[PDB]
Amino acid sequence: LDELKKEVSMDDHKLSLDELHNKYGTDLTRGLTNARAKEILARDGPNSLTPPPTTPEWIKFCRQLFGGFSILLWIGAILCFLAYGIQAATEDEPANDNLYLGVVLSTVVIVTGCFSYYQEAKSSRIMDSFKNMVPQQALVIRDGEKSTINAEFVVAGDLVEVKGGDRIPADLRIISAHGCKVDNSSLTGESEPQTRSPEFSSENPLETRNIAFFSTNCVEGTARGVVVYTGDRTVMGRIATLASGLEVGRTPIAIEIEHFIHIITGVAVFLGVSFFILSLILGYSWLEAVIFLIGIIVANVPEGLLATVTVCLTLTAKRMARKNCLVKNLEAVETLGSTSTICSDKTGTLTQNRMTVAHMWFDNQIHEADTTENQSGAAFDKTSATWSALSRIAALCNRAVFQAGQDNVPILKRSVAGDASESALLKCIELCCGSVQGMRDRNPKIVEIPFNSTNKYQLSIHENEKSSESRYLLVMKGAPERILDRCSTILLNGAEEPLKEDMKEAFQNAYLELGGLGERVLGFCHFALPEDKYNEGYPFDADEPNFPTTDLCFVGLMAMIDPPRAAVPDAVGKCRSAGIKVIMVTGDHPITAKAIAKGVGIISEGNETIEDIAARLNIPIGQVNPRDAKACVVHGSDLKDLSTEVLDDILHYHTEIVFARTSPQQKLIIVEGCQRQGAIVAVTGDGVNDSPALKKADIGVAMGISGSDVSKQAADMILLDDNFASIVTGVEEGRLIFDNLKKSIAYTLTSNIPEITPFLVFIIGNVPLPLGTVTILCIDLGTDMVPAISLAYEQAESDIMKRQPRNPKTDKLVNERLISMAYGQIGMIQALGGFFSYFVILAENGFLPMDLIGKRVRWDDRWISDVEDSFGQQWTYEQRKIVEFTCHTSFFISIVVVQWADLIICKTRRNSIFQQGMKNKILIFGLFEETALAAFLSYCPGTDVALRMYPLKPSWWFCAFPYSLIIFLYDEMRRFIIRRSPGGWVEQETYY
Amino acid sequence: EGPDNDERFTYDYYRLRVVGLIVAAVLCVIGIIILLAGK
Amino acid sequence: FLGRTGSSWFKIFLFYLIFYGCLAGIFIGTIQVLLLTLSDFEPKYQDRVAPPGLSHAPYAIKTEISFSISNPKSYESFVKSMHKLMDLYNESSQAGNSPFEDCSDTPADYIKRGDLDDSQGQKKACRFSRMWLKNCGYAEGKPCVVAKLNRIIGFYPKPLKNTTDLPEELQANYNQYVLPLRCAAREKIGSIEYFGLGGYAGFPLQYYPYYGKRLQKKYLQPLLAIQFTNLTQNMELRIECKVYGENIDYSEKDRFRGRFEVKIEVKS
C-alpha cells in the first residue's frame, strides 16, 4: 500500500511556463476562472490531508482481556459460576464461595486489563502535525484579481502568490519571483534559505529552484507560481500519509511478554487437564472435578505478574523523566537497551544546528576556536596584535545584531537577525572580545557596500576609534581567493609586510585544510586609508568606486561549520563500546556529512571509503577492491537507483556508514534495511524529514528543544534538554530493567509451586486441603507485590555497557533456566516448608501425619460432627475446619517466610549478596510491609470471615524458617559455583 | 490442676491478636522509615 | 531431542535425583524432630476442641431426619448408623475385669486413674450397658435418637449449680453428678422422653476424665437416648437438644458446639 510512497517523486519543472499551463488549463496572468476553480475542486477534491482510520479505544481495551492469563482466569471465573449454578439447583448451598470467587476473578481480569492497556499505549498524532503546516488561507489570482481564499479551496492550475512570512499552500511551479528565498528544512532538515526563481536549475525537482513545496515557508521576497499538486498528492503530503500510515508493530519487550505467557499458559493447561482426568479416574464427582480445576487455574496463573512488569517499567520511566528524558510509550523504556543499530540524523541531533566559527588563520598559523555550546574547550590566542585586527573586521564588517531582550541567555544560544555566517562571526567576537555593539559605537560606520553576488565581497569604512588618528579605516570580507587578489601586505604578528609567494602558498595550504574539514572559509582584510588623501569630511561613494579596493592588507582567514553538540562525540563512542552500530542518515550534502562523521566518531581515524583509496593511490575507483574500504558515503541520488538487496550488501559490508542527501522515504528505507538483517534499530532526529524513519524505528527518539512538532509526534521518547548523552543512559537503563525483570519474574513464579503442590497432594493423598484458593490471591495480589516490584531498583551486577546487545532470537526474558530454578528447585523447597507447617498445626491439635492419609472423605463430611483424631478425641464439623483454615493461614505465612530468602536470592543472578549488599531500600521496605500485611491478615478481627484467615500462635511463624535458610544457602552455594567456573554446567543450567 | 484444669482447654487469642497487630503496625512504621530515607 | 543431547539429558537426571532425594531426606528430618517434641498420651494444644461438641447417631442428610412410617426402606438408612454406634456398646465387648470395671449404676463423681502416664497399664474404663437405654430395629414411628458428648482428654464436664434459676427449673436436679440434656423447639408440638444411666437425662460423671486412645483403648463414653413420641405428623419440626454446664458453651457458627440441630418429619 505504502510501497508507492517509499519511492522518489516525478515532476514537471522541466516544462516551459506556457507548456505547464496547457497541462493544467490555466492562465499565467489572469489565473483560473471562479467557475473553473470550483469545477476542479469537485473533480480533484480539497487541498487537505485526511487522517488515517484509527482503532477505537474500546477494541484496544478488550483485546488485552483475552491474552493467555486472562483467558485462563476467565475459564476459572466462569467455572466458579458453573459450580455455583450446579449447587443452587441441587442442594441449596447458602454459602457464597463460588459466586464471590467468580466475582473476584472477573475483577482481577478487568484490572489486569487496565495495566496492559496502559503499557500498550500509542500516542500518535502525525497527520495532525502535518495539517498544521497548511495555512488557513492562500492568495490566488482568479479572473485577473488577487483574493484570499480558504487554502483547502486551492486546486491544481490556479495562480498563487507568496511573500516573506507565509507558508507554501501547495506544491507550486514558480513562474515569477523577486528575491524569493525559501526554508526547505522540511525536506532536507537544513534551514538555510534556498532561492526560488522561474528558471529550471536541476534535473532533480527536490533541488531545482522553480519548484516550491507544501510544508515549507517563504523567508523573504515574493513569488508567483502555478499549483501542480494539492493535498495528499503533494511531495510532503505523501510523506505525511507514509508516516501516519506505517504499521506500528510489536516491541521487543512486548514479544518477550507474550513468549512467557505461552510457556506458563502451556504448563497451566497441561497440569490443568492432566489432573482433571487424573481425578475422574480416582472417582471424583464432576461437582468436585471442576472445583479442583478452578484451584489449579489460580495456582498456575501468576495473577500479579503482568501488573508488576508494568509498574517496574513505569518506575524506570520516572527515573528517566528526572534526567530530561520523556517516555511517551512505556515499552520504549526497554527497546533502547536491546538496540543494536542507531540511525541518526545530523543537523539538530548530532549537531547544534548553528553556524559557528571553528578555525582562524592568521600569523601563518591555524588556530582552533571552541565550538561547544557551554564552551567546554580552551582559548586559542588573545595576545597577537593580528588577532585584534581580524577581530575588528569580524565585528565591523558585519550587519548582524542580537534580538532585543536576550541579555539573560548565553551568547551562543541567543537569536540573531542575520545570515548564518554573520551570526557566527558576531557570536565569536562577542564571546572573546566582549560587547560587539561597543566596537560598532567606537568605530562609526560612514559608508558600506553590502555583499554582492558579483563583487563576492563586503566592505565598510569606519571612523577609527583611536583619538590620535580618528581617521578612516576600510574593512572587507569575502571569498578567500577574491580577498587575496586585493592584498599587497600581510599583518604578521603586528607589523605589515609584502605578500611574497611563500605566504601566498601557506594561505592556499591553510585554505585547503580548512575546506577539507567541511568548513566554510572566509577571507578578511583591511586598509588604513592615507590621511592627507582623505579629510575628516571626505565623502565616500558606495555606488561608484570612490576609494581604492586593491593593494589592501590581508589580515586572516576564518572558517565555520554547524558543529557537533558537546556530548555527542563521547556518546557515540560509548554506544560503539556497547557494540551498537552507529549510522548517519542526513538530508545534508556529503562533504559536510562526512566531516561531522569523523568529528563525532561515526568514521574512526584511518578508515577509508573507496574514493579515499583511489585519491591516495591516484588510481581509478573501479581499480579499488571495495572490501578494502570499511567506511562508505552514499549520496541519495545513487541510493535511488539501488535495489534493497544492494542496500543490504552496503549495510553488511561496512562498519562506518554515512547516508547523505537522503530524502525522508530514503531514511525509512535505510531503517527497514537494518531491520531486515534482524537488528533492533533506534532512530534519533529532530526534523519533519525524520518522521517516517522515527515511526518505523523500533524506538524513535526526538530532540525536545530543537525538534519539530512532527518529529516529536513520531517518536517514542523525547530528549527535553537535547542532551545526547541521554541515549547512553537510556541504553544502560534499558539493559538494567531487562535483567531486573528476570529477577522479578523468577521471584513471582517461584511461589507458584507451593500453591500448586497442595492441590495435587489433596487429590493423590486424600488429606485435608492444605491451602485455599482465596489464600493464593492473598499472596500473588497481596504479599508478593511490593517485593516483586522492588527488584526493579537493583543496581547492575557488572558493567552492562561492556557487553554486546542481546540477541533477541536467542536471549529471552524467560527461558528454560528460569523455570528450572523457580519451579524445579526453589519453589519445590518452598512447597515442603508449606507442608511442614501444615503437618505441625494438625499434629499439635491431635491429628498426627500418619492418620491424615485418606481422611478428607470424613473430614469434609458436613454431617459427621464427631471425627476421631489420633488421640481418640471427637471433633464437630466447624471445629476441625477452624484448624484447617488455621493450616491455610500458616501455609500462607510459610510462603511469606520462604519468600524472604527468595527475595534476597533473586536480588542477584551471579553475584553474592555479600558482594552486592543490601542497599535497595525499596526491597527492605517490601520485606517489612509484606510481613506487616501477613500479620494483619491473620490477627485482624473479622478476617476469619472475609478471607478465612485465623490467628497464628507465635511458634507457628517459625515452622518455615529452616526452609527459608536452606534456600539462602543453596542459592548462595550454587552462585558460588557459577562464579568459580565460567565453564558452563551450573551456568548453562540455572543462570537465568 | 485436677478437676479444676480448665486452663488446659483455653487460649488467649485476644492478647495474641493485640500483640500481632502491634507488631504488624511497628513493622509498617519501620518500613516507612527505611523507604523515606531519600523517597 | 527437545532440549539437549543424551549426555545433557542424563546429567539433568542425575542432578534432580540427588537433589530431590536430599530434599525428601531433609523434609523427613524436620518431621522427625516435630514428632520428637510431642507426647504420646496428650496433644500439645486442646483449645480448638475446648467446648465439647454434641453429636448423635442418626446420620442427618442436612441436620435433618425425614422419613415415612408407612414405608420400610424409608428409615432403614438411619437405622444403619444407629446400629453402628450401639453395636459397640455390646456386653460381649465388655468382658472380664480387664480392661473394664463395674461402676455405680447411679450417676457418681469423677475417677482419677493417676496421670497421663504409661507408669500403669491400660487405665480401666467404666462399663456401659446399652440396656440402660430403655425403649431403644428401632423406632419405625417417632424416632429414638441417641446423643453423645465429644471426647476430650483430661476434660472434666462440670454441671451447673442450683444457685439461681434454670431452664428445667430444679426438676430431678442431681446437681453434684449429672450433665443435663434438655431438647426443645412456642412450637411445643411433641413429647420429649429421655433415657440414660441411672434413668437420668444426663451424662454420669464417673466416665471422666478421658485418658485418650493410647492410655484407654476400648473405653466407652456415656450415651443419652432421646425419644420423640410426638402426637404430630407431616411437618418439619426444628428440635434442638442442648447440654448445660460450666465448661459448656455454644457458637452461632458451630451449630454442633454442645447442641443438636435435628429436623424430624414423620411424613406418613
Ligand SMILES: *[C@@H]1O[C@H](CO)[C@@H](O[C@@H]2O[C@H](CO)[C@@H](O)[C@H](O)[C@H]2NC(C)=O)[C@H](O)[C@H]1NC(C)=O
Ligand atoms: C452387638 O449386638 C447386636 C444386638 O443386635 C448383635 O446383633 C445380633 O446379630 C445376630 C446375627 O446377625 C442376630 O442373630 C441377633 O438377633 C442380634 N442380637 C443379639 C442380641 O444377639 C451384634 O451381632 C453384636 N455385635 C458384635 C460385634 O458382637
Ligand SMILES: CC(C)CCC[C@@H](C)[C@H]1CC[C@H]2[C@@H]3CC=C4C[C@@H](O)CC[C@]4(C)[C@H]3CC[C@]12C
Ligand atoms: C509434585 C512433584 C511430584 C512434581 C515434580 C515435577 C518435576 C519432575 C519437574 C518440575 C520442573 C521440571 C523441570 C523444569 C525445567 C527443565 C529445563 C528444561 O530445559 C528441560 C526440562 C526440565 C528439566 C524440567 C523437568 C521436570 C521438572 C524437574
Ligand SMILES: *[C@@H]1O[C@H](CO)[C@@H](O)[C@H](O)[C@H]1NC(C)=O
Ligand atoms: C417402651 O417399651 C416398654 C416395654 O419395654 C413399654 O412398656 C412402653 O410402653 C414403651 N414406651 C413408650 C412410650 O412407647
Ligand SMILES: [K+]
Ligand atoms: K517507532
Ligand SMILES: [K+]
Ligand atoms: K506466585
Ligand SMILES: [Mg+2]
Ligand atoms: Mg535534523
Ligand SMILES: [Rb+]
Ligand atoms: Rb498463582
